[PDB]
Amino acid sequence: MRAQANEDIVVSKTSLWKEMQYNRDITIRFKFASSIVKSGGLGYKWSEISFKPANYQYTYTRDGEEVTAHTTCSVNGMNDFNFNGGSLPTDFVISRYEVIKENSYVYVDYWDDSQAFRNMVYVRSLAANLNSVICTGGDYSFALPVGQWPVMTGGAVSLHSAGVTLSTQFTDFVSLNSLRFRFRLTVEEPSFSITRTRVSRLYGLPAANPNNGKEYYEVAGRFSLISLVPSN
Amino acid sequence: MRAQANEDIVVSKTSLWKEMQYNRDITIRFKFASSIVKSGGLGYKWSEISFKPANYQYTYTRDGEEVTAHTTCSVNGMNDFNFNGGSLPTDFVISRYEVIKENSYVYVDYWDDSQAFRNMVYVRSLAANLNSVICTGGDYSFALPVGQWPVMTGGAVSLHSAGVTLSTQFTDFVSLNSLRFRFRLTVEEPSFSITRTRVSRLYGLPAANPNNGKEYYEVAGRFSLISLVPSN
Amino acid sequence: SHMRAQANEDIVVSKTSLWKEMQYNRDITIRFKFASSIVKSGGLGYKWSEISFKPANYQYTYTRDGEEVTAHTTCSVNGMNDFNFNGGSLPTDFVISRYEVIKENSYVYVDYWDDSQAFRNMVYVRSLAANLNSVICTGGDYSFALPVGQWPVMTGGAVSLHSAGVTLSTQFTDFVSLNSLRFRFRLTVEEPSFSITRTRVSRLYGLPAANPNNGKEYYEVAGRFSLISLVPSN
């Protein structure tokens, strides 16, 4: 029997161990990170534009109280694209840039300072309900030493909750007991392109500017689970 | 008391915790992965040839049922070799390539979807028996801009079981409770060499093409252990 | 309830048929060291692109009550600060694109494990407390050997580490995964400042990643700790 959105319900009790039913409403805020590396030489060539795990620490209000949360966003199933403007030192070139599409997965680990994430190691009856969110690509200019600047623009995917499992966010200090939410992707308008090139009408989200100026992407949800935790 | 190759026997049980004797025959299939990086200039030079962890997911039959397994192969203690065929821009070179020998170790993490690996965190009386396996190097052509092509060829080591400990395979999604099998190596025939050079009669397994066209290497074995796990 | 009797001991706080709460009290000698990744700028020889900190492992043994203790530590840093020196763009101009320095806004973490009973199955801990001495880390010299000209030398720098919290962690070695305690150390910058000879860089405070160990085999922090751990009875 439940009574409120955010609650801890004792399921079983033993001297040292207890099974707790934890139900939490959560506000998941996260962001992507990118690794953009330029090649040597005159400055017309980029060797890599790829995704990398991004952390985000924040606070929000739940039941009149301040919640402190930490997320870690990672991706997989990235697709490799490239642009070859020619082999001359002055020819614009991106050797490799990543794009997440419908064959890609975005994962967001979530932890908050409430009791539910305390010693969260053995979970059963895990259930979660999460909203969907659209991520769009911001513009990214490739400042060439001379001439007009090519500009990667567009791109978009919508994230859809598709599974949850336990995970550990290995921060610099504490290793947080977390829930890892997997999101499947659906490509959305607009497609991306690179101005001043023959590249256009491609669908997916490039790793050039996946946050598009936003401080974070937000997904609201809630979970319910039974966790076997120490009694003392 | 035992009865069959694959079984779960309750050693002792309490309302929330229980000790299980898990016995299983296992088919370990794994593989290597390599990072081959080229240097700048004309394209007659390689900067690095090193091993990197490799995952392998597969299925096989055990007592008439389909078992789903996942392995992660990593190596440590590799040896750095190199080839310097000149100073000129147009001269074939390998600045550093890894070779595993008798002073090296290969580790294979194993997990399968049977009850034995669920919540495998506290293990007593861990015992395992594993066959040995031979890993051989396949050819690897160094595609020069001009001239015929060097081809690293040969190389081999036999893996011999040398201990097991618990580990976790941190996959893009689920973090699998696994058994980490360590293997000591013995060099074997054929030695390795690089055609069109004076390199030959060297022993060990180079990182250029350690899988030798195979999809996986296979080691059959069995383990027996007692695991303290949640009752529900 | 339970009472202490000596410096190193295991005390049964509670016991059931599969689980038990043990209080582990220990004197520890924490020995660790830093590691750095130093990379030269290709091309010819007057430029460096990186000098950063990288985690470092250290294995050692020491005595505790007449017995030999085997320990393993992993030192990592966070909140480092990025510095650089640009003495020209021409091939023959001295350049270090980025070198890290830890200051008062940085943290040094030292993960500790030893082969005693206390670290066996350490997963659920409470009443965790530790008393550690402070330790001063100073930077040794680092010469930027060049083609020609008198060589610049990164010299000086110092910070003192002060215990600022402990949490559980795992040291993931090549084989075994060690249940450990991660000690966080906040820093206070100390004299002397650091500088680079043959340049206008001087009077900067903090510990550069060039030669943080100053030739020592290890840095050592000592103390003792006490904690209650929920472990399997068998």
UniProtKB/Swiss-Prot annotation, chain C:
Forms the spike 'foot' and 'body' and acts as a membrane permeabilization protein that mediates release of viral particles from endosomal compartments into the cytoplasm. During entry, the part of VP5* that protrudes from the virus folds back on itself and reorganizes from a local dimer to a trimer. This reorganization may be linked to membrane penetration by exposing VP5* hydrophobic region. In integrin-dependent strains, VP5* targets the integrin heterodimer ITGA2/ITGB1 for cell attachment. It comes from the Viruses. Homotrimer. The trimer is coiled-coil stabilized by its C-terminus, however, its N-terminus, known as antigen domain or 'body', seems to be flexible allowing it to self-associate either as a dimer or a trimer. Interacts with host ITGA2 (via ITAG2 I-domain); this interaction occurs when ITGA2 is part of the integrin heterodimer ITGA2/ITGB1. Interacts with host integrin heterodimer ITGA4/ITGB1 and ITGA4/ITGB7. Interacts with host HSPA8/HSP70. A motif (YGL motif) lies at residues 205-207. Residues 146-166 are annotated as: Hydrophobic. Changing residue 90 to D: Slight loss of infectivity. About 50% loss of association with liposomes. A motif (DGE motif) lies at residues 65-67. It is found in: Virion. Transmembrane segments: none annotated. The record marks 4-5 as: Cleavage. Residues 5-234 are annotated as: Spike body and stalk (antigen domain). It comes from Rotavirus A (strain RVA/Monkey/United States/RRV/1975/G3P5B[3]) (RV-A). Disulfide bonds join 75-137. The lineage of its organism: Viruses, Riboviria, Orthornavirae, Duplornaviricota, Resentoviricetes. The chain holds residues 247 to 477 of 776 of the full protein. This is Outer capsid protein VP5*.
